[PDB]
Amino acid sequence: PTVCPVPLAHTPTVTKWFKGITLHLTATRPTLLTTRKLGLRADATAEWITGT
């Protein structure tokens, strides 16, 4: 084992709205986005995103 360098994606732009957010995301290469709620139901979602 050792330490490998990995890239950091462009920081997303978050736009708020009543009980909701909109992440404008830019990633030249497939970047993983994983979201989950903090309640009884995780409602976990995972997606590999490309482009903008």
Partner: peptide
Amino acid sequence: GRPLQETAPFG
């Protein structure tokens, strides 16, 4: 599939 670090509820 995704691990439990990204699916466990209640934060």
